[PDB]
């Protein structure tokens, strides 16, 4: 067949390690575009972002050159990348042992020498996230692609400006929206430059899981702690009520500590609210113990009334602040 003829012709002496430049003072312009098809997860316990998508490679191999008229058309031809040269472009913030692709067995080569690859992949990428508004947090995770072997004088990583589009994924957790990728240049020993593309995706947590698990038991334990100082001290049920709030808030703290990551810069607002509720139970237990201590003078109810007034107004302020965060 004619498809075997050009394949045996233009791969008769091809070496997969030779950089395809006609002159020694020349580079190859490798065009990249990462496109996410599905954001799988954002594991903040280990600061990784698991995602699925395809990275569009496009370079210009001048050694694979022919005219279609000698082969009766056939502009497109498909070669595995194990027999042609490929640029070593990997993630700059890879979060696993080795970088592997889902499909990497074919690459489209045109008659003009330009080569497309498009290997689909599952990318685990490190991305910095600040949990100062957990779980009502808007995020931004970056994927950095580039060459760690070839410098700028060997290859040139270029974004494609012909498709300056933006896309969105309406996940049930994250309302993922994309940011226009840019090029940022990393140096090496202040002489050699190692270029690379950077692509941000702006995650936005729209969750009903973390609200139901963390927001509503914390505000209801706050409600019970506010209901506590109407209990009269001379029956001996206020102290066991307070220690029940202590145990329930300890269980809620253990929930939160199981879910909140170790890799933490600032305290989340749900954690600060839970700490506020926990120390509020502590202060109310102090007031109950003092009240029953001098109950053995009996004009205690105005102290509990002003304590409920202060805790009511400050709890309304704190809850309104957390609602303004949401």
């Amino acid at each position: 067949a004619d498809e075997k003829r050009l394949l045996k012709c233009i791969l008769h002496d091809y070496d997969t390690a030779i950089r395809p430049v006609q002159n020694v003072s020349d580079v190859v312009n490798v065009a990249l575009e990462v496109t996410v098809v599905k954001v799988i997860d954002l594991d903040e316990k280990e600061h990784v972002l698991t995602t699925n998508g395809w990275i569009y490679h496009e370079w210009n191999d001048f050694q694979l050159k022919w005219n279609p008229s000698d082969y009766s058309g056939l502009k497109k031809i498909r070669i595995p990348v194990d027999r042609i040269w490929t640029p070593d472009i990997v993630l700059f913030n890879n979060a696993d042992e080795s970088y592997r692709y889902v499909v990497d067995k074919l690459a489209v080569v045109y008659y003009t020498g330009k080569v497309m690859w498009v290997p689909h992949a599952r990318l685990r990428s490190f991305c910095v996230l600040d949990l100062s508004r957990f779980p009502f947090d808007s995020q931004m995770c970056t994927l950095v692609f580039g060459s760690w072997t070839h410098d700028v004088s060997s290859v040139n990583v270029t974004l494609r400006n012909q498709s300056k589009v933006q896309y969105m994924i309406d996940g049930k957790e994250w309302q993922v929206t994309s940011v226009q990728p840019k090029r940022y240049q990393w140096t090496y020993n202040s002489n050699e430059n190692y270029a690379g593309i950077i692509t941000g995706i702006k995650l936005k947590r729209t969750s009903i899981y973390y609200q139901y698990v963390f927001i509503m038991p914390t505000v209801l334990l706050a409600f019970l702690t506010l209901l506590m100082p109407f209990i009269p001290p001379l029956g001996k049920e206020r102290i066991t009520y307070g220690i029940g709030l202590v145990l329930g808030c300890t269980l809620l703290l253990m929930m939160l500590s199981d879910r909140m990551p170790t890799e933490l810069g600032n305290v989340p607002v749900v954690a600060a609210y839970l700490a506020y509720v926990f120390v509020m139970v502590a202060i109310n237990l102090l007031f109950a113990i003092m009240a029953i201590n001098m109950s053995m003078q009996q004009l205690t109810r105005v102290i509990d009334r002003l304590l409920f007034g202060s805790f009511l107004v400050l709890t309304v302020v704190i809850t309104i602040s957390m609602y303004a965060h949401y």
Copy 2:
């Protein structure tokens, strides 16, 4: 032997990367049928479906052509796929790093050129599931198979209509039933088309695990919360009973939050019932605290009677609604 003769004959110049078409404007029709032998698990915590089954490949390789009379019969012959051409057909929603097969070492080739492969595999597939009726939920998970390298003008993925059958698996968790697969066409840059088969399987959770773990302690804590307002307030055991319900419902919430996934769109009905029980304990604690607060006028029992009446009728309505869900 004669089996070596045709193998050395029709693989004397075979290239595994050449697409087997006689004309350049021709495609190869690859027939697919996925068949599940056992659905292993549906991990909704990570939205994956682990299953075991074999995917039936069938294409037409015109380069492997011979007559049996020159080889004294032998219509069937078995070649490993590492020496012949195979289509790059993978899952469109694969949920692991790389796509691998359990057995992929043989493929049946006939004298008419048609090639069967049948590689058995363990497929981890992403599938969307809405837990609005957890755990009495009927589901539907899809397996999408297709080529991410060859377009429609190179290969053509075709369902086989000769076997339009349906099957079922009677698992102890899922009553798995199958749906007639169809073909859905995915586009690429609005010019190149990338076809593929889609196969739905309709899962149905028939579980006694999640009922015993979640349904019966929630309804029994509801029963205890309904029994609560018959306790007289002037003994100081109602408040510790209410905080015991608070701690028990917190433990049940921690059970549920351990089992309910983060990847959540809507709240499950067991979660809504547990939240209703938890806020019912909150309202009953408010009423008990108010009652013992003005116990220091003594006609409290009619308020507790009407409160039990309202909680009884609304609890019967909610439990009847959850039973109508089941």
Copy 3:
């Protein structure tokens, strides 16, 4: 040396994909015997059985044939399986991504053409288990070995009847005993037959872990629930005692739900006993609340006496039934 001479002689034109039959209407009889050396674990949470053992292959390769007198003896010779033909026999219920062996680098070939392989392996096998008597359960897990590529007309999987022996392993968990393997024939599209061996091993759980973790706290919480109705109602300690049983039985339920698998057909007897204890605490709390409700007529002790009598006789019946299970 003479060992290289026959190796270069009878592998001078050997193809590893040719099925070794002299006539086209002939099969090769591959003799199998799986032998377990150690049953590692039975993970019922994922329905897998991890085991270690060697599978004894034995077939008849007529292409490796020589007389010892031309090579001065040397009946035994050892060839890696990468250079000779091997049958593609795998597990029919494999529970991992790919089937791999611990040692697969040598195979013994005799002068009569018969070939032994014996690759040792760690097998993860799916096996159906019914937990209707957890944890006093006698089990049976099956290992099915066969070819998914070669049919009956290509290879023939045969058990060896020369060694019809039975063995046993005295593990600290499982008293593992073996069952005589048999041959069961699986069909494919009702025309092609795909044979295979099946080997059952009869596990028997002899555990002191699950007894100490689950049986004794459940029966002691039953003992405390039986001790509950001797508490007089007019002190207000019966209700907090009952809610303490509620919280303790909730903790025990959370233990059991952590250990009991999701993949569940029937409720275990320890789970049914725990549910019975939990609803017994519910009924006793109902009786205590009713008693203290009409304590505000004072002839309550006969009701508690008959309640203890009914709960005593039915608890003795249930505990005797669970002991008869053991």
Copy 4:
């Protein structure tokens, strides 16, 4: 260079599968010595021992033979094992899917034909452990190395008696000391013998983790249970104290069951002590309920005094026995 000359000379016709014997009735003596550099962990939950060390191979390859005077010295030469013959010696109790080495890329070959390998490795080995003295337990785990392909008539596994040394590792968990390795011979079908070395290492748990987590809360809950019968029954705080001990001992039991393995032969002494404390709380709750039951004759304090006396003397006996275990 001269280093390439002998490498091309004595590997000009080398086959990596030929067993290096001049006569057919000859074996090769492969000398083994495993040396542990660091014991990583002993996971008793899965009965594995993770360790790091190098296994010293030494055999006599008569096919790699030369005199140094033809190559101007160069007695030592270094060949990768992929081009020379190596014996297939693996662990007899391997605890992973496949046996792999950390470094296996070089092997030292001398001019006398003797070959050293020394591949460093991370070994996961099954070893039997009896937890009858957890966590004050002295242990012994074995590493068994041998060939599962070559029998005694092919290779001969030999310990080296020139280095009959013993070593020790002072870990913060295990005071690891080594035992002089010996040779134990395993049979196969009572005709073929499969030899192998066995090496015991005597672990000794010197832990402050398991003491602080398990020993001190159990003995302090025992202390509280002993303090319980001084509470007078006519205040209704003894029953809630006893149910608080029930809940605390249930939490401690859940700690222990999380840490104690399923793979259990005998109950640990900490588990037996916790069960004794738990049933002691049960007996004390029975005595408190009886006392408050006939409190409605008032000479109860001598019964509580003799109960404290019996529980004191038997608790001192049990604690002295557990201290004598330590």
Copy 5:
């Protein structure tokens, strides 16, 4: 092209296993420098340090030698390491099964024969850590690189003194600072020396996670235990308050035991503080039980006053000591 000419010239007879020395009594000086770009995690539960960085190899290959004037410049050339010799330098304390690189597909070779490699990698390294000041602990973890095959007489591992720089990473967990690497020489059978570089990095935990999870509930439970002896004994709420502290401190202990590793040498200060709080609750429960025991002479308040005085002054001493640790 000219780039293929020298590649075919100086690799026309290259063997990848020959050590590149002109004389037999010569070594190759391999220059190493590990550089960390991001410290991923320090898992003290398994004593591993996961990090990302590149290790700078530099050796002198005299077999790859040419002048640029015969090839019109081209001093730099890039060869994959699979076709040239590379030194077998691995981690001496590797914490996984096999040592693999992220990128290892290129290596820069100059016209003077010196070869750079720079493979980026994710290193899991064992490092000793003493948790005597958890979580306010300054740490030091070491990465040891060297050859386990080539001795000092074959290769020579050398640090590069031209870049004696120090760097820092401002993580949200660890304020990572680097230490000047040195060379330490390991012996083998007291005759052969096996050199290697060692590089320390000085970690410093600056966390708000472990403080909020462990420090504040322990000090607040200490605060509640200090508030306990103002409760009058003749109401029967002191004992249930003390058992509530017992249950809350048990939950906090279970938090800490879940987070504190088994691999423990000394008790952490948070663990010692929690044990002190737990035994303080025990002593206060003893004093409350004694007080209510002889309440049935009534001058008890001075004993509780001196007990609060002693517990106040010793708690201030302990908390000031833990603050001086911080």
